[PDB]
Short mmCIF file of C-alpha atoms in Angstrom, two decimals:
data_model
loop_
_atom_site.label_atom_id
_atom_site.label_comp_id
_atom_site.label_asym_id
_atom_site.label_seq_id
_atom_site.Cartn_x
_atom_site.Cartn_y
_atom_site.Cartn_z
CA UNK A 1 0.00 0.00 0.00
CA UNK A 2 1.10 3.47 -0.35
CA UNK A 3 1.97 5.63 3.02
CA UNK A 4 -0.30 5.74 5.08
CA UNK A 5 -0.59 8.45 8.04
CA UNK A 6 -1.04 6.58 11.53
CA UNK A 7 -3.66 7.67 13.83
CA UNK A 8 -3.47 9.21 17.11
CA UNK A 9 -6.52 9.93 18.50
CA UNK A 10 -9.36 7.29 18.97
CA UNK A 11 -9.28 3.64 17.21
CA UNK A 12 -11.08 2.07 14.06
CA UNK A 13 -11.74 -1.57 13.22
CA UNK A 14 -13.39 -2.13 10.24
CA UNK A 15 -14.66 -6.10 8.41
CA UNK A 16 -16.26 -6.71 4.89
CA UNK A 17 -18.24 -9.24 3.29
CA UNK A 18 -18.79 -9.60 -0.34
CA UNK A 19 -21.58 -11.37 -1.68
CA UNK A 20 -20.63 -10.51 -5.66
CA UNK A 21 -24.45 -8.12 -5.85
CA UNK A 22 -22.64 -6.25 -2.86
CA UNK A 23 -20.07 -5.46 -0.44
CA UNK A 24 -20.63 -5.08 3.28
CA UNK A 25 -18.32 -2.69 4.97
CA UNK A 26 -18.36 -2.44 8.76
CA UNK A 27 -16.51 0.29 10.87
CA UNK A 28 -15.99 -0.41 14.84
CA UNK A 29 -14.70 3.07 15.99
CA UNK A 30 -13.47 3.43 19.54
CA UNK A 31 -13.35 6.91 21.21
CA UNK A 32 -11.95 8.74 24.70
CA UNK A 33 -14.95 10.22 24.99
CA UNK A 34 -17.60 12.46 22.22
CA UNK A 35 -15.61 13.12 18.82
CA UNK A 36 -16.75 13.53 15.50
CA UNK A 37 -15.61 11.04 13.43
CA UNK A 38 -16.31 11.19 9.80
CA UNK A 39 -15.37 8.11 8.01
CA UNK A 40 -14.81 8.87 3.95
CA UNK A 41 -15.13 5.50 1.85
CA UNK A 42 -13.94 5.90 -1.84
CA UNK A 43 -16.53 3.53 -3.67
CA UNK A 44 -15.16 1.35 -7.18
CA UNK A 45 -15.24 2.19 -10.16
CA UNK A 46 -19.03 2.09 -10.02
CA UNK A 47 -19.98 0.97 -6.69
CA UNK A 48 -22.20 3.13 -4.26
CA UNK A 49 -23.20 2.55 -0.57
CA UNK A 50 -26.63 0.75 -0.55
CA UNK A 51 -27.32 -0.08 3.31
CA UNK A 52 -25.43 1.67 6.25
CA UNK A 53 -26.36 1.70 9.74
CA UNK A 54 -25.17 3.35 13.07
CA UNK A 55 -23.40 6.38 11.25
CA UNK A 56 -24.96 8.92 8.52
CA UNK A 57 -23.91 8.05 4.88
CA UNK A 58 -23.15 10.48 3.14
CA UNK A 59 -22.36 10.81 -1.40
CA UNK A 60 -19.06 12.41 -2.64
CA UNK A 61 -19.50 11.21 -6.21
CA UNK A 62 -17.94 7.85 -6.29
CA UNK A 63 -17.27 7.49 -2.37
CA UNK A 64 -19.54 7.97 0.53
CA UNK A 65 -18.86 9.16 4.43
CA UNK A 66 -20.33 7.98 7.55
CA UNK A 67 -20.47 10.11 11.18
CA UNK A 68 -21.86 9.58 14.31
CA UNK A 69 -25.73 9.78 14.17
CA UNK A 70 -27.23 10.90 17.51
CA UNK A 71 -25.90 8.41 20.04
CA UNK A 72 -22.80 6.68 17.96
CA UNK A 73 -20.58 9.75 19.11
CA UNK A 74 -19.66 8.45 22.72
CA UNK A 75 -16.41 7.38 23.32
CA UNK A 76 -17.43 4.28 20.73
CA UNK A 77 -19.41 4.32 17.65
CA UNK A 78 -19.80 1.41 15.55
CA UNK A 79 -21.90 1.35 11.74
CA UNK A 80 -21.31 -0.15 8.81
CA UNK A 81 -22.11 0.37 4.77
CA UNK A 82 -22.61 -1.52 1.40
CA UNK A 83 -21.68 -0.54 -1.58
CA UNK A 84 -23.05 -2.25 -4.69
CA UNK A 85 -21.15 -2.75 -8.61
CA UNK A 86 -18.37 -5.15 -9.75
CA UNK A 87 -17.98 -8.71 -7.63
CA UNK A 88 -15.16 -8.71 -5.24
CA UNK A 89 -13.66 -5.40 -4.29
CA UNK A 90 -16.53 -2.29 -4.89
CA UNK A 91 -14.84 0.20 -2.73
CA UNK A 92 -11.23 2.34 -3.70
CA UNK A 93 -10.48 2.49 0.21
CA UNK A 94 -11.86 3.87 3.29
CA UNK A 95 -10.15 6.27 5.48
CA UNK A 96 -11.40 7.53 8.78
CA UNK A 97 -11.23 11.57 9.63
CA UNK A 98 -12.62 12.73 12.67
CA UNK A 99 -13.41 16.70 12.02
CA UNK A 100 -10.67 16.98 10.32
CA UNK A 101 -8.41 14.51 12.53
CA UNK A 102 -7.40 11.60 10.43
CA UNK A 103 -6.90 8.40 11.91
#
């Protein structure tokens, strides 16, 4: 992979299951206390988010981003996405940026 920056403020874990009509994306984020995490999501060439949960989903053309909705901004917010296109890989990366605050 190319360099990647290293976080240093809260903690991210995040699984995915393809099932070729769609790829499920989920994002465990652990927190010191109430931050905004925004968590961007590039999508494929052709993939969008379909079903997301515990976090708002948001459109950037291509990519999607997910915050804390109004009780995943404790110190620990979990959701998830699922983008839908080619079978296999439907999402250019996802990289987590709370307010700003990349981690």
């Amino acid at each position: 992979g190319p360099t990647t920056p290293v976080p240093v403020s809260g903690s991210l874990e995040v699984k995915v299951n393809d099932w070729g009509s769609g790829a499920e994306y989920d994002v465990t984020l652990n927190l010191d206390g109430q931050y905004d995490w925004t968590v961007k999501v590039k999508l494929a060439p052709g993939a969008t988010v379909g079903s997301f949960w515990s976090a708002n989903k948001q459109e950037g053309n291509g990519y999607v981003i997910f915050t804390p909705v109004s009780w995943n901004k404790g110190p620990t917010a979990t959701f998830g996405f699922i983008v839908n296109g080619p079978q296999g890989d439907k999402v250019e990366e996802i990289t987590l940026e709370i307010n700003g605050q990349v981690i």
